[PDB]
Amino acid sequence: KDLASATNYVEGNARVTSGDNFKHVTATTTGTVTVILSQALQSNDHSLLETVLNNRDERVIRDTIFRLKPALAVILLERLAERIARQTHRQGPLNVWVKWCLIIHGGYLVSIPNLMSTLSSLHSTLKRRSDLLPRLLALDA
Amino acid sequence: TLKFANNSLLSGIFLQEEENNESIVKILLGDITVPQQAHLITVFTNNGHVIVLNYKGKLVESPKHFKISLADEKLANVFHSEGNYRILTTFKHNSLQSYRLYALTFDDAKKQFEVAHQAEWHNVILSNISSNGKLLAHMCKDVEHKSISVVSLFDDSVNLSFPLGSILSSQTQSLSYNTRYVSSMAIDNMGQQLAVGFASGVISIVSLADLQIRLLKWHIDSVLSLSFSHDGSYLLSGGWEKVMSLWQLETNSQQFLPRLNGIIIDCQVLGPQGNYYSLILQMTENNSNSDYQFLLLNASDLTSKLSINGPLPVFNSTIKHIQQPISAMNTKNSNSITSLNHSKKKQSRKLIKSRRQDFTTNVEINPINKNLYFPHISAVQIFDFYKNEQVNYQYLTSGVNNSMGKVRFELNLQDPIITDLKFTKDGQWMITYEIEYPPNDLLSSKDLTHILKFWTKNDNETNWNLKTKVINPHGISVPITKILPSPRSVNNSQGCLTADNNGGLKFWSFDSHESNWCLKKISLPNFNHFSNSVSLAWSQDGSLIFHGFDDKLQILDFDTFKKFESLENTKTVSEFTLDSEIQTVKLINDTNLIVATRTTLNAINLLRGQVINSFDLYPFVNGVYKNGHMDRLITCDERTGNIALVINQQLTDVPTINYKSRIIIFDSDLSTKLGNFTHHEYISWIGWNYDTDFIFLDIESTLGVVGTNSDIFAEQLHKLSS
Amino acid sequence: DYVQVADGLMVNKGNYTLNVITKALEDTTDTSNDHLDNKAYTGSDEFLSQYKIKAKAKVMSIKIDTKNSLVIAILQNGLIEIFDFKLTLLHSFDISYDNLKYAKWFTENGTEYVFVLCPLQDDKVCYKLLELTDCGSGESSPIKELSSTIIEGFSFENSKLCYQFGKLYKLNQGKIYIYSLPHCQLQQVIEFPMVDKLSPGDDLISFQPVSVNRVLLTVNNVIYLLDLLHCSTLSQRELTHVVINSEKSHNSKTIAIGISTKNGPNPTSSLEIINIDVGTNTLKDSLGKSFQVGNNDSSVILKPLFDDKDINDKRVKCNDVSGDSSVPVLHCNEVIEKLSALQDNDITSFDDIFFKELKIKEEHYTEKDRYISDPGFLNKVLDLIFGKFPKTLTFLLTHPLFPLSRTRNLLSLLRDQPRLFKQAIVTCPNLPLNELLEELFSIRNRELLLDISFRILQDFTRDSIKQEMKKLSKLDVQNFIEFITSGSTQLFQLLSLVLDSIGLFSLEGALLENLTLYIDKQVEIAERNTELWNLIALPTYTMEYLDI
Amino acid sequence: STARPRIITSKAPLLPQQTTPEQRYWRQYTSAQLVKEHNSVTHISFNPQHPHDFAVTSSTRVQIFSSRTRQVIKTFSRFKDVVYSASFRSDGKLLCAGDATGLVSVYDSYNPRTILLSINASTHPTHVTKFHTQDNKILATASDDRVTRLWDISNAYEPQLELTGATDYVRTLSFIPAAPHLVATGSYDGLIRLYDTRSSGSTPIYSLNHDQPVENVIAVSPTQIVSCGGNNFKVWDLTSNKKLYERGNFNKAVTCLDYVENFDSPMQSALIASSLDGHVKVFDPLDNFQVKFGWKFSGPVLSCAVSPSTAQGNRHLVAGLSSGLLAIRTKKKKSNNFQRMMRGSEYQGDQEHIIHNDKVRSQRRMRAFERNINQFKWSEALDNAFVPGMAKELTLTVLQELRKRGKVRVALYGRDESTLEPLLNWCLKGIEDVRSASIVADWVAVVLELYGNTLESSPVLQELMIDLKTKVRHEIHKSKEAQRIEGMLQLLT
RNA sequence: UGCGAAAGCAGUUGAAGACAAGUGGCUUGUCGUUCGUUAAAAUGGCCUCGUCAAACGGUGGAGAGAGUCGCUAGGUGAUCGUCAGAUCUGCCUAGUCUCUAUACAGCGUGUUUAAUUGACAUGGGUUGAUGCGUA
């Protein structure tokens, strides 16, 4: 090609990222589903993770997360964050799970030393969901 | 390269600190002194000196120069034919010039050229001369309107004239002024036809014997340049689209050449058979300077044989009687048919009266191969200064920069501005930051995008590859005031530190595992005040970072990335409130650091934790630079000192359009002014190349530097076989 | 250039050992050791010893005795080894070697015949160097470095008995000519205030620096370029800096002339014969952040005033960018004399202090930028008005409008005049957030709440607000929520800050439901006026009329 | 002059859980085959040499499948009890099978009728039989006799070495892949013993205490070996006798392992693990045995294998389940007068001094929207956006190119009811996504700015505007509640 | 236009002269005219140099598509009916379940961290659109 011809712009396979991925630093309760959820999260079992969080009764979700062990509430929250990042219609039903994980395990993940670095994907997903709120405010006006 | 300032032979013609209207106006190939014997050129300047210069071998140390007996006239051009020589001159009502043609002779006393005065034209609007130089056309403004007159100059073969209302259509008199304004004209080597290019976009070939016209409509914006071929059967035209068209005048058939990195402000055929086209490309994405690229190209395959260009910086403001060229609408890249006079009056008044006379730019030096990278608008000119020719040119944003010649409305769109770029200290990566602007008259027209890109090349290839880009670093709509590359001790010189106008900092670094440049460290404060008077510095050890926000120089560490702390409280002063917002925090070496703010210039030691020296800046740099540009005005070294740099706009007996530069150096914490230099022109950027020199960029872009039997048979055979 | 300053034989062991340091003793029989226990046998003792070392075995120990030779000891087992005499004059500083590293038969008198670490292995006779008063052993390529008071430097390598280099080093009577921490140099201290580093590969000075103050017992630490130095008649062992992977914190070197300062670690209490107390407990020299602490060996501050770029035909200054003036006529002598003109009998009046300050600094009396000023000068005139004399109407208005006020601002709540207090809220450019939060939560229910919330938001980071607004009671925050709900943008985000910083659980319910209802209607009105701001042909048959 | 820059497809910031190269490669193992066996598939080995066939050990038969048709080419049915192990020799020439009566029978592969020799091992069931990987003429059989045996296949009467020492149920052998004297055996008491065969052989030289009862031990390097048993697997440096990684990423016991090297893959090595709960997972030995991909199967997976390192054809992952069936997932791969007349067209300049090259490279074909943006047909470019078969990022990038480049209004000028309905009917779908909704916002804003009268006239885009209103209502409830979650974890810092 | 932060905060928009049109003046409008102020349109758009097919290597994906009326949560309709509720085995959406050449998109394989080969005489002539129906 010519020597005076400028180089065109080409991204190629450059990784486009945002500025918000901080990935670097007797019974009497119900019949819940938390053994299913716990041995979904001990492995990486997307299939039975989907069969445990297609349950959407609020008291079942509530005491399920209450009976959950708090050392893996952070990875339940990571799985929920990645699923609502990918599928956008899940944000309605699945963020009921993410608000209950914060309310119940409000001590474990305030005692964790790097909250944003450990659940970066939630922060990036909610930042990109709520960043454009003035724009669709102007749109619906 | 015949350097003018190399010798007093013709630097005595011009070395002035105030007067650069002495200009070089024509070059001829022969020798006007003695005929019939050529390997040397005779240059006519715009005042009346005629220098004869040998460009084969070493330049002679006494050229054959003369000075023609001239009136107040100022030398439009000279003309050559067989044997004879003409010259044309300009004059002193409505502001129009006035032209006057002489003929030359030389022979009797070999110091003076005698002149003859053929004729005059008492008001000239526009002019052109044919390719052979045998005839010339021009415009008149003689009443209801203008007029058009063609005249052969080396003979009275033909001289005709007519009002151009007989050229113009009947539709144009009830249409806009662009339809009757004419921005170009050309004649062929016979004077049979003439091309009138109008500001509306059309061209019209009139046939001069009978004044019948033919319209050629392709240019959707103003026609800026026209030329004929030698036989007159092809018309080259160029305009605001960056497309050179050539019209086959038999069938009216265009051949195009579409993406010519600048608008064609002049085009002409060049060879005896017409095998070259020479073009001038105005490159009008920056409105702050008129930077022309000279490009001839062979006519066979239309490839750019020998494109020529100077360095292309973009200054923060317009420079010196710079007028962006004519067009159809008044845009942010051009001006309409009305506003050229008002714009030049306003620009002269702005250079006289106003206060923010800062037109300073950022230039970078690639620390591997010592070539300097002028970031143009949405592009970079990589340019090496040991031969002062451009390495290449590369588009670094995603605009409509290259894909399209923008026209009358579309010139109100701007491609994203590259405002920062810095190399990592081993020269392996190039960090760049750009502001992507939205088009007007829609919902998202008032939120910018801020994009930080990371480029890589090996040491052979001339162009960089984007490895990653982060859109909105630091958050949405927030700028990056300063990026700083990191020293060789953090991630093997593969980290960058970006600063907000919130005082937030982000440390980005390239790790090989996830093979990308990712976000490592973060310190965000959430204030409610913003200021772009942000500066940054790093310790060479890689231990502590000096975050010079406005009025406040915080001291952060690197391990926990918060403000510095020792529990023993050994007068751990980790903030230095100064009298004004600080714009340079340049640390010369690990002992001390020079702060520069808009009143004073302090220096602070850290092995003796207090102020050591101070200087007064307010009488020199008061409210004249934008806050954040003292960092490009002053610089440092790694051993041998620090360089301040001030500017005095000169005065009459009010300020003027003339400038002088006062650069000063200091060694070893502001001790001695061991360099006090004065340069004849405004100075725009100074920076230390990595081998103990400091390069600076003049406002007219001269880069300067502050440093430390058989013999006769052989001769006759090389004659007779060449 | 100091370090963290406090604390007013096998050379690489520590504690949990028995005695890896057996050393000689002043005014005693020969030698001793102690534990935190190994036996103290004899290495053919009772001579004129001045130091004592071992072969890095502690049961092949010795007593380095001034008899031209030395033998082995049995400090663990009971079985001795044989020896062989070389000289008979003075071997008081004998240092037995490792497995063939650095050994020669140099006793005291220029007879450095090379040998090995054995009782009968020999080498060449490398006694060529002159009478050296400072012979040390380093590990460049294990080498005897001789500095001679015939003055000349030489360096022989006891790896092939090869004289590497040598020159004429004019070294006088020294204090400690100790080898460097990386061994590449020689730190030789001059007597009172100086310590020069010389190149110990070519015998030439590389950096001759002065020191801070009096120091006598100086030796290079196990650092990059740092030394330790104890005072002569002082127990003060300070540190200075002119191993790099995971450096030392204690047990670095034992050469000191304090009150029996043997076996000097960081916690240097349990000595080898002394049984003393301990001191500092820091590590060696770091890269560059500890030199902001140890900012010593320079204490020469003067009164730095703003100079000017020197007037070399300054009359061609070419359109100066000021308003009307060109240069302020600097009077630092009048700046100092204004102190005497102010510290007078204007004990309640503004006739001899405020007029004095506004005459010395001809300004608009609320504005900066006609500066020529020093922070010590402003602090001393602020002290002279904080003495016998806030009733001045010009001086203490024009100098909280100065960015160098230096922390005499704490009584700004403790004095309460309305206009001076609001001006010290808005413009005083260094304020303590403790007093700012106290003034914020000591509410007088006015617009100065907005003026104090403005500054507390616009000059402190949010987490530094949160950590120091944890330091509040609960009646303050309950009345703050009550006053916000009663009766704006910066106080909304301040309310966000108080909710983030009160904590998680320990709240009440009625205040929470009241705040919930209030901010529900607040979001509703914010939504509707955001909507308001974002809110800012022919038929087939007609019938018409015309003029008659 | 330059060439024209291509229209860059709008890529947003990347979302979490992107497609890694490892999981793209391991996800193109597809077209699953399910073959119902008579009983649980206990072992599966591959042919080493022409690595293109594999033997599946069901109950009382061993079937060799081909790696190009996936049908049973050959079968071995003349066992008396349940056949347990079946492996090929390192030359791939013959096939050993341990049987529940303790009768090792070795046939030759690809000939089920010629049983070559029947070693009568212990009276207990022989559960693992494999040849040496360096040597050819020795066969190691461990049985439920708590003693393994090395047999020379010439002298098949007494075992040439008898490796005893284990307290319970030796179920696995392994050989160390550079030292051929080194046999690592693994039993149901934990305790990977390993033996130097030049010594006595009744005592291991050392023992590695996997705490769970091991199910398999394989050798990865000449130095490190991996033992699975219980819910985890551990890796052991063998020159230093010392554990250095352990991954417990399963629910139930890891039944088997195998390992791949140097094959055509982004992963330079791969250890896959099969674990009685349905899962088979692949772990990358170069970044610390991190899991990269996995398959879930319809029952507890008892054994697994992949095609060997030099497969050169159709490549296989096979997993045999305890349910009694077998799952295969593969990745696949004019006249002499006229020629004498047109001879030279394949020469390419070998003996020729100068070789000129200015044939330009043929670039990718331009799509219709890209050539219409090139031809400045901006309304036609919008029309080419809203065809049905267009990718969502392609509609987004032509909207963004018309937004940045020229004029939304130019692209929308000559429209009416029938030619706006594609745009708004796509804007319904694009208003949900984050990456599109800014562009959807300003395009809808411009079209209602300059078509507010067609709003009055046509009722059949009024309803489209109403549906768009309820869409922005749902999206604004979502963008408000996301800010509420953002605040409610900003509280927890 | 100035100060600014990317928000915003203060300032506006005169005079002379000439010319054109309309009805020597009067009105209106222009200016390749000057002084002062910090101050939309002339049917008129971008070149050839070789395409097609099949791979391969990284990069993104809202995945490209097809089912099961299988589950979870919903939004809603026709007719009758006092409602209760009936039939339409009511419809639509999202998630889940199942499957495919990851079907989708993009950059590259001339040297690159990586990754490419093959077809074709890259012509001329005659019909080819009034010859066509599966709608």
Coordinates of N, CA, C and O in Angstrom, one line a residue, chain B residues 168-207:
Chain B
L168 N -22.5 33.5 -16.1 CA -23.4 33.0 -15.1 C -24.7 32.7 -15.7 O -25.1 33.2 -16.7
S169 N -25.5 31.8 -15.0 CA -26.7 31.4 -15.5 C -27.8 32.4 -15.2 O -27.6 33.4 -14.5
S170 N -29.0 32.2 -15.6 CA -30.2 33.0 -15.2 C -30.8 32.4 -13.9 O -31.5 33.2 -13.2
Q171 N -30.4 31.2 -13.5 CA -30.9 30.7 -12.2 C -30.2 31.3 -11.0 O -30.8 31.4 -10.0
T172 N -28.9 31.6 -11.2 CA -28.0 32.0 -10.1 C -28.4 33.3 -9.6 O -28.0 33.6 -8.4
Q173 N -29.0 34.2 -10.3 CA -29.3 35.5 -9.9 C -30.5 35.6 -8.9 O -30.7 36.6 -8.2
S174 N -31.2 34.5 -8.8 CA -32.3 34.4 -7.8 C -32.0 33.3 -6.7 O -32.9 32.9 -6.0
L175 N -30.8 32.9 -6.6 CA -30.3 31.9 -5.7 C -29.3 32.6 -4.7 O -29.1 33.8 -4.7
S176 N -28.6 31.7 -3.9 CA -27.8 32.2 -2.9 C -26.5 32.8 -3.5 O -26.2 32.7 -4.6
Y177 N -25.7 33.4 -2.6 CA -24.5 34.0 -3.1 C -23.4 33.0 -3.4 O -22.4 33.3 -4.1
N178 N -23.5 31.8 -2.9 CA -22.6 30.7 -3.3 C -22.7 30.4 -4.7 O -21.7 29.9 -5.3
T179 N -23.9 30.5 -5.3 CA -24.0 30.2 -6.7 C -23.4 31.2 -7.7 O -23.2 30.8 -8.8
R180 N -23.0 32.3 -7.2 CA -22.3 33.3 -8.0 C -20.9 33.7 -7.5 O -20.2 34.4 -8.3
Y181 N -20.6 33.3 -6.3 CA -19.2 33.5 -5.9 C -18.3 32.5 -6.6 O -18.7 31.3 -6.8
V182 N -17.2 32.9 -7.1 CA -16.2 32.1 -7.8 C -15.0 31.9 -6.9 O -14.3 32.9 -6.6
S183 N -14.6 30.7 -6.7 CA -13.4 30.4 -5.9 C -12.3 29.8 -6.7 O -11.2 29.6 -6.1
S184 N -12.5 29.5 -7.9 CA -11.3 29.0 -8.7 C -11.5 29.4 -10.2 O -12.6 29.6 -10.7
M185 N -10.4 29.5 -10.9 CA -10.4 29.6 -12.3 C -9.1 29.1 -12.9 O -8.1 29.0 -12.2
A186 N -9.2 28.6 -14.2 CA -8.1 28.0 -14.8 C -8.2 28.2 -16.3 O -9.3 28.3 -16.8
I187 N -7.1 28.3 -17.0 CA -7.0 28.4 -18.5 C -6.1 27.3 -19.0 O -5.2 26.8 -18.3
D188 N -6.3 26.9 -20.3 CA -5.5 26.0 -20.9 C -4.5 26.7 -21.8 O -4.4 27.9 -21.9
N189 N -3.6 25.9 -22.4 CA -2.4 26.4 -23.0 C -2.7 27.1 -24.4 O -1.8 27.6 -25.0
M190 N -4.0 27.1 -24.8 CA -4.3 27.8 -26.0 C -5.2 29.0 -25.7 O -5.3 29.9 -26.6
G191 N -5.8 29.1 -24.6 CA -6.7 30.2 -24.3 C -8.0 30.0 -25.1 O -8.7 30.9 -25.4
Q192 N -8.4 28.7 -25.3 CA -9.7 28.5 -26.0 C -10.8 28.3 -25.0 O -11.9 28.8 -25.2
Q193 N -10.5 27.6 -23.9 CA -11.5 27.4 -22.8 C -11.0 27.8 -21.5 O -9.8 28.1 -21.3
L194 N -11.9 28.0 -20.6 CA -11.6 28.5 -19.3 C -12.6 27.9 -18.2 O -13.8 27.8 -18.5
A195 N -12.0 27.5 -17.1 CA -12.8 26.8 -16.1 C -13.1 27.8 -14.9 O -12.1 28.2 -14.3
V196 N -14.3 28.0 -14.7 CA -14.8 28.9 -13.6 C -15.4 27.9 -12.5 O -16.4 27.3 -12.8
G197 N -14.7 27.7 -11.4 CA -15.2 26.9 -10.3 C -15.9 27.8 -9.3 O -15.2 28.7 -8.7
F198 N -17.1 27.5 -9.0 CA -17.9 28.4 -8.1 C -17.9 27.8 -6.7 O -17.7 26.6 -6.5
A199 N -18.3 28.6 -5.7 CA -18.4 28.2 -4.3 C -19.6 27.4 -4.1 O -19.7 26.8 -3.0
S200 N -20.5 27.3 -5.0 CA -21.7 26.4 -4.8 C -21.3 25.0 -5.1 O -22.0 24.1 -4.6
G201 N -20.3 24.7 -5.9 CA -19.8 23.4 -6.2 C -19.7 23.1 -7.6 O -19.0 22.1 -8.0
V202 N -20.3 23.9 -8.5 CA -20.2 23.6 -9.9 C -19.0 24.1 -10.5 O -18.2 25.0 -9.9
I203 N -18.7 23.6 -11.7 CA -17.6 24.1 -12.6 C -18.3 24.5 -13.9 O -19.3 23.9 -14.2
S204 N -17.7 25.5 -14.6 CA -18.3 25.9 -15.9 C -17.1 26.1 -16.8 O -16.3 27.1 -16.6
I205 N -17.0 25.4 -17.9 CA -16.1 25.6 -18.9 C -16.7 26.6 -19.9 O -17.7 26.2 -20.6
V206 N -16.2 27.8 -20.0 CA -16.6 28.7 -21.0 C -15.6 28.5 -22.2 O -14.4 28.2 -22.0
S207 N -16.1 28.7 -23.4 CA -15.3 28.7 -24.6 C -15.1 30.1 -25.0 O -16.0 30.8 -25.4

